[PDB]
Write a protein that binds this ligand. Structure first.
Ligand SMILES: NC(=O)C1=CN([C@@H]2O[C@H](COP(=O)(O)OP(=O)(O)OC[C@H]3O[C@@H](n4cnc5c(N)ncnc54)[C@H](O)[C@@H]3O)[C@@H](O)[C@H]2O)C=CC1
Ligand SMILES: NC(=O)C1=CN([C@@H]2O[C@H](COP(=O)(O)OP(=O)(O)OC[C@H]3O[C@@H](n4cnc5c(N)ncnc54)[C@H](O)[C@@H]3O)[C@@H](O)[C@H]2O)C=CC1
Ligand SMILES: NC(=O)C1=CN([C@@H]2O[C@H](COP(=O)(O)OP(=O)(O)OC[C@H]3O[C@@H](n4cnc5c(N)ncnc54)[C@H](O)[C@@H]3O)[C@@H](O)[C@H]2O)C=CC1
Ligand SMILES: NC(=O)C1=CN([C@@H]2O[C@H](COP(=O)(O)OP(=O)(O)OC[C@H]3O[C@@H](n4cnc5c(N)ncnc54)[C@H](O)[C@@H]3O)[C@@H](O)[C@H]2O)C=CC1
Ligand SMILES: CC(=O)N[C@H]1[C@@H](OP(=O)(O)OP(=O)(O)OC[C@H]2O[C@@H](n3ccc(=O)[nH]c3=O)[C@H](O)[C@@H]2O)O[C@H](C(=O)O)[C@@H](O)[C@@H]1O
Ligand SMILES: CC(=O)N[C@H]1[C@@H](OP(=O)(O)OP(=O)(O)OC[C@H]2O[C@@H](n3ccc(=O)[nH]c3=O)[C@H](O)[C@@H]2O)O[C@H](C(=O)O)[C@@H](O)[C@@H]1O
Ligand SMILES: CC(=O)N[C@H]1[C@@H](OP(=O)(O)OP(=O)(O)OC[C@H]2O[C@@H](n3ccc(=O)[nH]c3=O)[C@H](O)[C@@H]2O)O[C@H](C(=O)O)[C@@H](O)[C@@H]1O
Ligand SMILES: CC(=O)N[C@H]1[C@@H](OP(=O)(O)OP(=O)(O)OC[C@H]2O[C@@H](n3ccc(=O)[nH]c3=O)[C@H](O)[C@@H]2O)O[C@H](C(=O)O)[C@@H](O)[C@@H]1O
Ligand SMILES: [Cl-]
Ligand SMILES: [Cl-]
Ligand SMILES: [Cl-]
Ligand SMILES: [Cl-]
Ligand code: NA
Ligand code: NA
Ligand code: NA
Ligand code: NA
Lengths: 345, 345, 345, 345
């Protein structure tokens, strides 16, 4: 990271590639931030999807990324393509001189994640990874409790993601449900919960995982469980399935330590259900209210970074922390063995 | 198992060894069943504990098991001694011609469990193992739902035992907190929940476990997590700690299958919290009411068995199913490897 | 094996324990051989099954094996009980001074098989294991071709047992479908085909196996496949399932060597389907006709042995050859690893 | 994959490198499709083989691939060279701006297969892999039955390739019978049957393999067997030998599921021998008739793709599915261990 000069007297310019489902949320976010930011170029290999985006946003349209990169003077290129394409696209963006914002997960394979970080490092350009859930109110209070050491020593952690994805979800596009482009219940659907393991609880020492495809016609897991050991000695598990009858049931985390016990549950870690500490704290009166956000807030940090006003909340190197866990869980489930971190020396 | 003749025209006679804490619950149970059963002999190596039992129950007292066995004409000898003594005591009882009822867990080491079953087999006498929680109302409804196949294919299971045991609990006696005589959070405190894994969900294929002593001054685990794979493909985890702040928090099970989702929680699997099936069933109207029992009910089955009126709900061979899981979890945690079942060919 | 004196001037005396399904075939066999042999004592722990046997055969009845052994002057005690009981019963017979004929498989666990052989050795009494299929006409021609070296070097072997067993088969009795008493598709249903691996092809070096319970509600496998390597370098596989739609389809073996190719198929290795050798042989004209037997013939060898006229076709030591393969296949499937022979040094 | 523009108003142009045995079948195929396609350039490092091709086809001749690539304006470059050369040649073609059609197998080493896909991806050009057997009538009906779910849950699969290749087959050229350029019984001779494992039955979880050179003077296997486990739980084996006495005997597949049992056999999966489903289907009346094709049909799809009329039936990414199985079988046979998929995270 060299010092990069702030961008001062114009809006920040965005280009976007992959005009599908979540691109809608990025369009909305950018619309909100229209005084500080504009979307000037969009790219999709499917003419209709590209048509809809160009008509909605007013941006110029392009049929390939390589062409858009030859033309755009965007500051940042946003990757909202299938997950397994993020690495090659990010590296091409970096090598052409652009900051990159990649949707999660940043890669589907470990060396691809590493290579996208190395390319951004060498270009002296930012790589932002979208982890928009971290700023949720419940997850912020948890993070604050952790930063203050309210739990003392952590002993036990349980994360559950009991959700529902029918066959028609995976059949919506060829990329979905594939190792190369998607990953399964852990790498795609529950990835914002995998993220909590290192971000809230701290460095992981090792994992032991089982995964399976118990019902869907896909090659990735629809169901999995992982035993986790933290370098602090804390132990825990994360359990996920997309096969829950008959709709989404639970997105929860329970954290138990020496001097505190918390559970945040609901369908999406959205309800503080248990909140008990050995000593009270100012933050405790926000607890009913804790129970925009998402992409719009994420974009405020990216904009501030470009203006010299802040630093990335989640850069490529931060993204590697949860990717390395996902890849250790996948190796452990594949080979039936404990896999320890870090993956590389 | 040869046919044994029913006992018809007298009360069933019990002797008991180990006049400590849970012996209180056996005394109460036997007092309840006083028309069908009597306690005629009690044994403890500690004079005071033995004194209290003899004065409460009226039974004759003995200072060693070997002496009591030379004297008593009990039908059944009840073992309420430290866990690691059950095997040698059971085998001595069997070899002297008595049916044995052992408190859980039946043994602390795998070959010791096997040997107590082999000795009872060779004597053609019963070995009952006390699993008094199975007849709890919540756990009975769950079992019934399982027997009816209400879930269809099971996908995902989570068991949590988040309880509290302070140092003074373990320091109460030398045997407690030791591998040889006790075992830890899984083998002692949460053993009635380990029991659910095979009894409710079915045959286990393998486990992967971590355990640790994170706070107590004992050699066994105070905290653990186990990843479980069932032969049906179902996956799950069980998470336990005795370090919960500041008192018992949760004893729960969640079961997710193709056509059903259930959670029974509370501090002791005592509250049906989620109960959703694809088709209704008669058993569904008992659900508020589900939310004596324990030892007294256990004793009714043991009495009925002795009278020819039933068969054991939980004999030594049934007890080996959860013991084999505990021993696989302990081997897996010790060696950091997946351990698959059955343990012996 | 000491020299045992022939039995000359009376019929050979049999006792039988376990008056169930295959005991019918032993009764028939003994009825056939009524001039050389008689059944004088029968034993079953179920009063009705014992009643039926006593009324059919005229033998005296007993309610326990231990009693029958105290009374009978049988030469041989026949074990037609659940498989997992054969070892303890055989050892008791041997230790009481009787020759034993055990139904297959001889044991369900390796050390139990070893112990029954050791006990018969120490008693200087025979242990016969029932492998009645070996004398089938098709299997005899195959064996003869092997003994003559008609194939030259063996290269490739495939055995398929594609059969059908519905849930009601396993539910018929508690012992069925259990590791301890039965074993699964390999150890029970297809055991006469496992037998061919060492008996026809020769010493096995190692196996690699997968097994699963894909549909039945039992703890043993309903489906399996094993990769086999012979010490000669020959390779092969055996594939079994009890889940075949909608009835028994195939019991076959294919053997390929340097100078010969054979397939014997049908539902039960009963049809010579392919029979091609580099040089013709006298045995080749029996080939249409090859395409009593069973228990009656087995009994002729047992009778002849007792009369000094022959030696056992299949004694306990011969039975250990296929048991050791089954146990290596079970260990390999359980642990996901190649298992090499012999099991013990 | 960018959108590539269709080729409309001329024939598609082909160039071919490696004017040996199977190039004959490509010449024939191209002759058939002479109104839509022409072969304009041929390449061989052996002057005579090149002479014969140029005189047969009328194409211009070249002595090196690098020269032909500098000259030809072919749309597609066809690789009919030794297998181990396909990757370097494909990558050179891609980097020079050509679509590539490679003969099977696409590579002999895993990273080489990956690299040829990566190079075609980066060039935005097609990589077709020749799997001409998939459109065989028998294999199409099987595929259709699979797509319709006629079997319900699959339980058991057996593939046998019992064929004959004498020493003179391998001695025909230096490349044959070598790991680097050929592979053995699985990667070369039976590769169209390995292909069925993922294409018909679905994603594979793991394999366990033995291979050997039992008779031929080559370094690759002439004989092998593989135990296979599918992610669905289905199990099976594939058995291959090139040592069959005295000529090709069997190319078969047997598939057993919940509600269907099929066997397609003959010398080359060319005879529907067993075809039994729980419910009839329109496709069932084609069954006698099922019992051009090959390269000519393959070429119709390649031509249609170039004309915008279809997409590849088998592109490089599709080719990686069977290559990854072959490489897992080779690693498993080499190291004597179960090898699980996918190979890369
Ligand atoms: N942050 C979050 O919470 C979420 C993130 N995502 C991530 O967003 C990405 C997109 O997911 P969706 O929008 O759901 O998928 P989608 O299938 O709806 O979007 C696919 C878009 O990319 C286009 N495309 C494919 N290849 C391309 C190429 N080479 N060049 C240009 N465009 C190409 C497709 O034509 C399509 O319009 C994935 O990485 C996913 O993990 C998705 C949902 C939630
Ligand atoms: N079913 C359930 O839910 C429960 C079962 N238990 C089981 O009951 C057993 C007893 O636990 P506690 O009553 O809590 O322990 P305790 O320490 O209160 O009881 C110990 C008794 O055994 C006596 N003793 C020790 N060695 C002896 C010997 N060689 N001969 C005769 N007496 C001897 C001690 O003097 C003492 O009175 C353990 O196996 C435990 O796992 C305990 C609590 C709950
Ligand atoms: N050679 C072959 O081809 C076959 C061999 N078998 C073998 O025969 C044995 C019996 O199988 P089935 O006759 O099918 O089973 P079964 O369940 O029909 O026979 C069970 C008999 O043993 C009795 N029994 C159980 N425990 C006993 C005890 N402790 N003492 C005395 N009797 C006892 C039961 O009451 C019952 O009558 C098994 O080992 C089986 O593997 C069975 C079928 C085929
Ligand atoms: N799809 C199918 O069913 C079949 C596919 N094949 C595949 O086709 C390929 C060729 O096999 P064959 O035609 O049987 O072999 P071959 O040995 O008959 O053909 C070899 C040709 O390539 C030439 N050659 C070697 N190195 C070269 C180079 N650097 N540049 C140019 N030419 C070179 C040789 O001189 C020779 O004419 C192999 O990959 C094989 O696996 C072969 C038979 C069947
Ligand atoms: C914040 C967060 O955790 N986000 C994750 C989350 O996103 P998002 O909230 O947008 O999903 P959304 O709830 O709309 O359901 C999506 C489909 O589910 C099906 N769906 C959903 C719920 C249900 O009960 N049943 C059901 O069929 C139905 O088909 C829906 O169309 O799911 C994304 C995904 O899976 O691709 C993950 O990638 C994200 O990490
Ligand atoms: C049915 C069931 O699951 N039984 C298990 C259960 O039994 P039982 O219910 O009798 O325990 P009980 O709740 O009385 O607390 C015991 C001590 O805990 C301490 N204790 C308890 C709760 C708490 O909040 N804090 C605390 O210190 C306090 O010191 C208590 O004296 O705990 C047993 C044990 O541990 O030996 C297990 O062996 C049993 O399997
Ligand atoms: C010689 C040989 O290989 N013997 C083996 C064989 O014996 P035996 O031939 O006597 O079986 P038998 O064919 O009568 O079917 C038995 C039941 O199958 C069910 N059965 C059978 C066939 C079928 O199509 N469908 C079916 O339901 C039906 O319920 C039948 O009642 O099966 C025995 C068994 O399994 O215990 C194995 O232990 C033996 O090794
Ligand atoms: C469709 C299919 O499965 N194709 C595979 C198949 O191709 P193709 O059908 O063209 O073989 P072909 O039957 O002509 O015999 C070839 C030689 O075998 C010898 N051969 C053959 C049969 C026999 O009985 N004896 C014999 O010596 C004789 O020397 C023959 O010259 O064999 C190819 C090969 O091996 O290189 C595999 O690469 C292909 O995957
Ligand atoms: Cl919740
Ligand atoms: Cl709760
Ligand atoms: Cl057949
Ligand atoms: Cl055939
Ligand atoms: Na898995
Ligand atoms: Na531990
Ligand atoms: Na298995
Ligand atoms: Na090999």
């Amino acid at each position: 990271m060299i010092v990069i000069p702030p961008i001062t007297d114009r809006k920040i310019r965005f280009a976007l590639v992959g005009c599908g489902r979540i691109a809608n949320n990025h369009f909305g976010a950018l619309e909100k931030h229209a005084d500080r930011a504009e979307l000037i170029d969009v790219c999709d290999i499917d003419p209709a999807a590209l048509k809809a985006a160009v008509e909605r946003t007013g941006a110029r349209g392009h049929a390939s990324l390589t062409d858009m990169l030859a033309q755009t003077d965007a500051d940042i290129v946003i990757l909202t393509t299938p997950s397994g394409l993020h690495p090659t696209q990010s590296i091409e963006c970096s090598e052409a001189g652009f900051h990159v914002m990649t949707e999660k997960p940043m890669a589907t394979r470990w060396e691809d994640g590493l290579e996208m970080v190395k390319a951004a490092d060498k270009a002296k350009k930012h790589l932002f990874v979208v982890k928009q859930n971290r700023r949720n109110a419940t997850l912020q209070l948890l993070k604050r409790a952790m930063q203050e050491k309210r739990f003392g020593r952590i002993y036990m952690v349980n994360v559950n993601v009991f959700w529902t994805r029918p066959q028609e979800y995976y059949d919506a596009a060829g990329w979905r449900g594939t190792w190369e482009f998607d990953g399964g219940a852990f790498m795609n659907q529950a990835s914002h919960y995998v993220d909590l393991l290192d971000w809230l609880i701290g460095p992981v020492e090792s994992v032991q995982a089982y995964t399976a495809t118990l019902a869907r016609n896909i090659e990735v897991e629809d169901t999995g469980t992982v035993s986790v050991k933290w370098r602090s000695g804390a132990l825990g598990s994360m359990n996920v399935t997309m096969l829950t009858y008959p709709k989404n049931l639970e997105g929860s985390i329970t954290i138990l330590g020496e001097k505190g016990s918390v559970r945040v549950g609901g369908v999406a870690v959205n309800e503080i259900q248990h909140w008990e500490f050995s000593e009270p704290h100012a933050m405790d009166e926000e607890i009913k209210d804790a129970s925009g956000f998402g992409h719009p807030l994420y974009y405020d940090n990216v904009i501030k970074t470009m203006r010299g006003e802040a630093t990335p909340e989640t850069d490529g190197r931060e993204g590697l922390k949860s990717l390395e866990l996902l890849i250790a869980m996948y190796l452990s489930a594949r080979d039936g063995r404990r896999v320890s971190l870090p993956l590389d020396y």
